[PDB]
RNA sequence: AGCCGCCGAAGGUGGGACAGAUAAUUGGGGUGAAGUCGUAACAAGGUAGCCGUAUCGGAAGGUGCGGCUGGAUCACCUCCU
RNA sequence: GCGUAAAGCGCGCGCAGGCGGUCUUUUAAGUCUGAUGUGAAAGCCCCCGGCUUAACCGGGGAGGGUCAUUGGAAACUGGAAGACUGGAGUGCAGAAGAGGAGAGUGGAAUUCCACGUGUAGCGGUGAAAUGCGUAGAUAUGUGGAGGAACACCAGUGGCGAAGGCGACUCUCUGGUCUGUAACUGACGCUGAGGCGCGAAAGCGUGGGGAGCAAACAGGAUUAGAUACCCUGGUAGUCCACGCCGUAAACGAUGAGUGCUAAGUGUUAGGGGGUUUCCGCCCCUUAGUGCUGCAGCUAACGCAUUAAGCACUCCGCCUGGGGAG
RNA sequence: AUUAGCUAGUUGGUAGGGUAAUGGCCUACCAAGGCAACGAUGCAUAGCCGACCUGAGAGGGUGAUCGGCCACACUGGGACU
RNA sequence: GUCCUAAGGUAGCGAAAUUCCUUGUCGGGUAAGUUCCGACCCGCACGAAAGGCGCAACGAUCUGGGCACUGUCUCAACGAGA
RNA sequence: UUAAGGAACUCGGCAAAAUGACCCCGUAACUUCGGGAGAAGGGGUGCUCUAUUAGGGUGCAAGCCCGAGAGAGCCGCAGUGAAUAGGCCCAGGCGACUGUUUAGCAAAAACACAGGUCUCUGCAAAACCGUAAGGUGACGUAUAGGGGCUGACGCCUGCCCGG
RNA sequence: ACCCAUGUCCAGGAUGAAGGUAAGGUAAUACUUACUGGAGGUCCGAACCCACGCACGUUGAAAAGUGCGGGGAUGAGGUGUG
RNA sequence: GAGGUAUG
């Protein structure tokens, strides 16, 4: 996932102008990466080493997502429809 | 183990086996179903009588009887002492005790209780082998 | 009182399930002073052993594919005291 | 208790649960505490008495509850509301790599086909023989076909959760480490039950099949040889797809965190002193190996890559065999 | 757990009747809940306790005799008094 | 061990649509079973594409047993019509 | 149509009898996971009133058709009241199957079948008919065509090349 | 009998293959449930075709039928004309 | 010192 696209998708959902280490940012970038990898797997189905890192991204995403849900539920019910989860 | 492990499953001790399984089972003809009852002694009917060659190191012939107990279990019983009264269809009383020489025997015949007539000519340990005092 | 109805034990019928006893026969298991055929393992056990798998073979077992050293003697290389 | 004795799932992704960094306030779910009530008599226990003592019997007391209500404390666990950063993660700047999938590509080199030269052996063994060969080999050169694996580099070297991954290029991808203190602010550790991956052998369908090769045939060997040994040789080995899900799947050593002497290689980094860079030196991070102090161990031996000292979590063992 | 789903008056509600008395105790109507990996459902076992035996104690086993409570009087059901 | 062979029948099945002896034997079913089912194996004379062994569904197939039903029968009677 | 019995008949339950329709409950071993299965085994069906019915169809509406449960009752030995309309189960051999066959004695376990295998054939194919021409094959082209054998599917198919 | 071309016939009902859509479910697939759909040498069953069993007929109503039952019945189908 | 390449 390229640096420029990464910068785009962090800066367009950053909670404020300094921030690039929030769960909003991480969950977004992870959704980008896991969707690109879903395509990668649907092409190269038997690259299970890649599928490993896929599932690690998914797990980290779910982890951040549960923390956010516990922290502020409005952020959560916002992000799910802003990103396409659930 | 961890305490959480010990809570998810407590301990479980060992399943004890008895020296004498067949003494620890009763029967009722009605139900035709065995009933666990701790018993010291049982009486039976000698199916067969014979001799055995025992294990290494030993070589002497050992007197046994294949008995059908009161509860229907078929059992091999050692015939201790010098000489005996027993033959086929002879009634016998049976206590527990393991003949270490002999593989398939786990029990003894009480000598002097029933048609097991006492030993001949014995003077010592008479309460064993079932001779009266002279 | 009698009669009618509801609920209603037992009983009958039916098909399933469950547990046990028994059974022609069959399978392997184990035990048993001195029976039989071989010698597979232990040493480099005389083809190094062993794990899985396939196949074959009177029997142990053999051969193949991969794997380990729980591998004996001899060699150069790395490394250490 | 689990390196070697029985005992670490082959490895991971992770729901539930268990466990959880530092500080302030609040409570009182757990904890602790004063009071009241009860926990029968008989029995255990203590103290008296009575039976010729004893056993026995009587009297009195005591004990016993994860007992309940009520009233108090906030140290710890838990719940709640905030705050912080050494954990955890993102960002930023760099570095290595046989990490994986796909497609294509190279030359050695085994075999085969053709053609010259070419004459009687070649092959193999402890000896041989079976076998190939005058219908012309063996070899030697040229050219062509076919597939399989990829010397040197290559190294107790790299990467990967493990299995495992070595010829080259491109595409698509994963993870790791180093430095910063930018950003969030405990977001974490484990992980039953599930889900997937998972050497080699093997199974189904269709190709390919050069070599090697179970089975098998022949020749020797042998007392015999359903084997080692020789000559041949089918399955297979290779590919696509899908099953199988086992292993001496092993570091026979579960994942995580911290702490507790050294010496020395080696890999990937960073920092600083010196010096014309080079080069040497020291400090530090993550790996990987050797030898060793404490300590542990039945010993062998492990020893900052613990088999040490401690905590969390999971799995597993409880004599041999039967019996996986 | 070599037993994971169970329940259908089953769960709650509005009315009604019934018992010495509350209550799906029962009836009618409405909704579709309720319980359960904190082991429900099912199978086998067992009367429960005071207490008894043992043990350094924690605990292990038992529930004869004595006392308390429960259940049952050939098996099943039902009422009358 | 030895003769002969081109080589001597492997698995699986087996008194068989194959078994003479043979109503084989044992078991089950029946009051009683030369038939039937299951096993055994001295396979007279199974046997691997004259295919071997197995098998759901199928069958106016063959075979044995059972429930129900019945004038098939014990043992016949009446009626109608041609 | 038949008392009582109910396969004792008989080569043999031949024939006959019995079952029979719609709805509802429920349904086994085995299984090629489609089936078995209408398994089996059982229950209810009539008429009247609630009823121009709850609800549907049609229609501009009037009107016209279908008719869901339920209660409350009525009558009979009996309510698909007649006729028409499966007997079921267990076990086994054979052939997988549907199909074909001896017009006029044999319907089958025989033939065929899909599938497997061998074999041949380079195209003016092979094979076949015919003296030949000419044709089929085939207006095809070795994933095609002819012949032989086996006969779905599953697990397999062994040794012998002397004749 | 086999075939060629051309026509025509098969009442009514039942089951419910592939596929597709939607909800649930997932990181995404699986996968589940429903609905739709309309497949089959499929089922039941008349016409049509056949001919399994029995009885009768047997100088027949008939030189192969009649009656009662029976199998197939959208297919390897039946039949007509030439 | 370690790692690597016939019977009893
Ligand atoms: K294969
Ligand atoms: K390994
Ligand atoms: K109730
Ligand atoms: K036989
Ligand atoms: Mg040996
Ligand atoms: Mg050896
Ligand atoms: Mg061999
Ligand atoms: Mg061990
Ligand atoms: Mg007391
Ligand atoms: Mg393989
Ligand atoms: Mg009891
Ligand atoms: Mg103790
Ligand atoms: Mg017959
Ligand atoms: Mg053959
Ligand atoms: Mg037919
Ligand atoms: Mg009659
Ligand atoms: Mg009658
Ligand atoms: Mg008869
Ligand atoms: Mg007769
Ligand atoms: Mg009949
Ligand atoms: Mg047929
Ligand atoms: Mg005929
Ligand atoms: Mg006929
Ligand atoms: Mg064919
Ligand atoms: Mg011609
Ligand atoms: Mg045939
Ligand atoms: Mg049809
Ligand atoms: Mg039919
Ligand atoms: Mg007819
Ligand atoms: Mg039909
Ligand atoms: Mg006609
Ligand atoms: Mg004509
Ligand atoms: Mg020796």
The answer, yes or no, to whether the previous bond of B57 is cis (omega within 30 of 0) is: yes
Q: Exposed, middle or buried by CB within 10 Å (0-12, 13-18, 19+), for A79?
A: buried
- Experimental technique used to determine this entry: cryo-EM
Task: Tell how far the Cα of A39 is from the centroid of ligand 32, in angstroms.
Answer: 68
Rounded (to 5) percent helix, strand, coil in chain B: 5, 30, 65
Q: Which of residues 20-79 of A touch strand D (CB under 7 A)?
A: 20-23, 25-26, 29, 33, 36-37, 40, 43-60, 62-64, 67, 70-71
DSSP state, B96? Answer: E
Strand D nucleotides in reach of protein CB atoms, 7 A cut-off? 1-2, 12-15, 17-18, 89-93, 99-102, 160-163, 172-175, 182-184, 186-188, 196-198, 241-242, 312-319
Residue B122: closest CA among B88, B86, B82, B84:
B82
Structure-token pair, residue A49 = 């080493």
Task: Tell how far the Cα of A63 is from the centroid of ligand 9, in angstroms.
Answer: 60
> What phi and psi values does residue B93 have, to the nearest 5 degrees?
-115, 145
Residue pair B119/B82 in contact (Cβ under 8 Å)? The answer is yes
User: Token pair 């086929």 is at which residue?
Assistant: B88
Find the nucleotide nearest A49 (Cα to C1′).
D100
Check whether residue B56 has its CB closer than 7 Å to nucleic acid strand C: yes
Measure CA B85 to chain center: 18
Check whether residue B68 has its CB closer than 7 Å to nucleic acid strand C: no
> What is the rounded distance in angstroms from the CA atom of residue B45 to the CA atom of residue B88?
8
Residue A80 CA distance to nucleotide D261 C1' (Å): 56
Residue A70 CA distance to nucleotide D161 C1' (Å): 31
Q: Resolution of the coordinates in A? A: 2.9
Q: Where are the alpha helices (DSSP H) in chain A?
A: 3-11, 23-43, 48-71, 73-83
Residue A22: closest CA among A56, A30, A4:
A30
User: Token pair 């916002």 is at which residue?
Assistant: A78
């Amino acid at each position: 996932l390229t640096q420029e696209r990464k910068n785009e998708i962090i800066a367009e959902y950053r909670v404020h102008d300094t921030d690039t280490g929030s769960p909003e940012v991480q969950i977004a970038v992870l959704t980008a990466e896991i969707n690109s990898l879903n395509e990668h797997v649907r092409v190269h189905k038997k690259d299970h080493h890649s599928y490993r890192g896929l599932m690690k991204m998914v797990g980290h995403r779910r982890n951040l997502l549960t923390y956010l849900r516990k922290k502020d539920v409005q952020r959560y019910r916002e992000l799910i429809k802003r990103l396409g989860l659930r | 183990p961890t305490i959480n492990q010990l809570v998810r499953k407590p301990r479980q001790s060992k399943i004890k086996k008895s020296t004498s399984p067949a003494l620890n089972k009763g029967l009722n003809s009605f139900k035709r179903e065995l009933t666990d009852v701790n018993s010291p002694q049982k009486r039976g009917v000698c199916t067969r009588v014979g001799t055995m060659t025992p294990k290494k190191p030993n070589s002497a012939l050992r007197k046994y009887a294949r008995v059908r107990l009161s509860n229907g279990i078929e059992v091999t019983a050692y015939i201790p002492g010098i000489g005996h009264n027993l033959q086929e269809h002879s009634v016998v009383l049976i206590r527990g005790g393991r003949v270490k020489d002999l593989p398939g025997v786990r029990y003894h015949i009480v000598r002097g209780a029933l048609d097991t007539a006492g030993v001949e000519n014995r003077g010592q340990s008479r309460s064993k082998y079932g001779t009266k005092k002279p």
